């Protein structure tokens, strides 16, 4: 019965609360998408836009939760960009070993950080332990892999640069999300091991049935998503 514009009208408050709490670039992109929904002419157009809001907003709240920078997809660095700027002395041999798999160079994770446009973090190991802790405490599916040349041991007498590669998501099939993510990045990790480059890859996911205290984002942010985008999806179907 209800037209789409009227659906957006009814959820004015929830969406105004959502936009107010997202990081600035993330909020703007969601606001544009919301007006695409408001002015949508086809049900397929609205749903696709809602899908974009779901993923973009979730990433904004993942960033806030972790005190990380939200990066719009257009500004997200690729793997090749990370090797170029963080491990320049190995970039040429990175190119050679990617000749049979050149799409590796263009892999663009949600977050691509390095230890102190690649973002900097204070400790990679702390993030990994955070993820492994919540996986072990709350049963949350993750996948994790670290590169390792041969059977090399960690060392105490020198520091090396390292990368942390994180994939996040908001979607129903949580197990499938992390299984497919780690599978996609497995070849890169093996490659990194052969280059002597230390990397960790992390993947995790939430869905709308995850207990509110158990998400990878702060519970306050869970309510904002459920009160806005999640109802929007409900209301798009009914009407």
């Amino acid at each position, epitope marked *: 019965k209800k037209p789409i514009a009227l659906i957006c009208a009814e959820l004015y408050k929830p969406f105004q609360d959502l936009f107010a709490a997202l990081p600035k670039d993330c909020s703007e992109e969601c606001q544009t998408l919301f007006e695409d929904i408001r002015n949508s002419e086809s049900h397929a157009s609205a749903w696709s836009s809602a899908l974009r809001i779901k993923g973009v907003a979730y990433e904004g709240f993942f960033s806030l939760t972790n005190s990380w920078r939200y990066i719009p997809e257009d500004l997200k660095p690729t793997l090749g960009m990370a090797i170029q700027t963080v491990f320049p002395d190995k970039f040429e041999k990175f190119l050679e070993r990617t000749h049979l798999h050149p799409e590796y160079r263009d892999f663009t994770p949600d977050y691509l950080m390095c230890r102190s446009a690649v973002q900097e973090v204070s400790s990679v190991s702390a993030v990994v332990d955070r993820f492994k802790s919540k996986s072990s405490e709350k049963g949350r599916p993750i996948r994790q892999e670290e590169s390792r040349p041969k059977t090399e*041991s960690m*060392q105490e*007498d020198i520091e*090396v640069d390292e990368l942390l590669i994180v994939e996040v998501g908001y979607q129903t099939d949580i197990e499938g999300k992390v299984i497919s993510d780690i599978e996609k990045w497995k070849g890169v990790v093996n490659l990194m091991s052969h280059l002597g480059i230390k990397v960790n890859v992390l993947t995790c996911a939430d869905n709308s049935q995850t207990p509110r205290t158990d998400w990878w984002i702060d519970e306050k942010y869970v309510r904002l998503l459920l009160n806005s985008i999640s109802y929007l999806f409900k209301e798009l179907l009914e009407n």
Partner: antibody, heavy 118, light 113 residues
Framework: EVKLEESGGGLVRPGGSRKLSCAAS????????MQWVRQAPEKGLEWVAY????????YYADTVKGRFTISRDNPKNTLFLQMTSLRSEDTAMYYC???????????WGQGTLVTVSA | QIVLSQSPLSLPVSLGDQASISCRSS???????????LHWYLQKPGQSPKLLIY???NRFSGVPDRFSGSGSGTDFTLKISRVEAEDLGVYFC?????????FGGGTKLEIKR
């Protein structure tokens, strides 16, 4: 003066358990990885286990995997080795050691003798 | 699971002569961080082992300067320029580039008489 002092050795029946301790002094224990090394009588040295400064990274010799647990208590400047399912082949002098800045064995205890026998 | 092969097994040497002990690795001990974790120890009779040389050629603080180390990759050598009576004992190389950490089998230095 850096010193490592092991305790807890003695006699255990096969299949049994024993916990060793190593008390460290003379350096900031909590900043450094710690290790166990053993030596069966009249034989060579055999590395046992490694634990990083903050317990994040642990390594074991394949012959002790699933049986021994290495751990530490940094406020108490103590390193531990929990041994279980002991076999006659585990009879040895057990040393704790550290690199005090590396994975080499720069400092060694006097050792504590574990005899596994009925 | 690097195998370290020491040679010779036993080394008789006259006081004041030089001694040379070889340690061969089954794979390279060059770590991706650029260091080579091959180390040398002496166990005197009835005593606990003692570090002589770490990372191929760094003499541990306080170790007599008659001890030196050299090598690269898979081939390493411990030298005693002038053997003293107190050098009696068993010499071990060991590696910590790879897990498990492994030891050579020991070289027994014997004082000739």
């Amino acid at each position: 003066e850096v010193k490592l002092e092991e305790s807890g050795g003695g006699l255990v029946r096969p299949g049994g358990s024993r916990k060793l301790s190593c008390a460290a002094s003379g350096f900031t224990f909590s900043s450094y990885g710690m290790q166990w090394v053993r030596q069966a009588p009249e034989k060579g040295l055999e590395w046992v286990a490694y634990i990083s400064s903050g317990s994040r990274t642990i390594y074991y010799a394949d012959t002790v995997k699933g049986r021994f647990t290495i751990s530490r208590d940094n406020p108490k400047n103590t390193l531990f080795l929990q041994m279980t399912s002991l076999r006659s082949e585990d009879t040895a002098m057990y040393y704790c050691a550290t690199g005090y800045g590396g994975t080499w064995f720069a400092y060694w205890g006097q050792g504590t003798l574990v005899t596994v026998s009925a | 699971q690097i195998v370290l092969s020491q040679s010779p097994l036993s080394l008789p040497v006259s006081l004041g002569d030089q001694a040379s002990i070889s340690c061969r690795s089954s794979q390279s001990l060059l770590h991706s961080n650029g260091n080579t974790y091959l180390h040398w120890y002496l166990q005197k009779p009835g005593q606990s082992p003692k570090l002589l040389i770490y990372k191929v050629s760094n003499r541990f603080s306080g170790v007599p300067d008659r001890f030196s180390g050299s090598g690269s990759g898979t081939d390493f050598t411990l030298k005693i320029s002038r053997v003293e009576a107190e050098d009696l004992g068993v010499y071990f190389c060991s590696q910590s580039t790879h897990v498990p950490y492994t030891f050579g089998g020991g070289t027994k230095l014997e004082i000739k008489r």
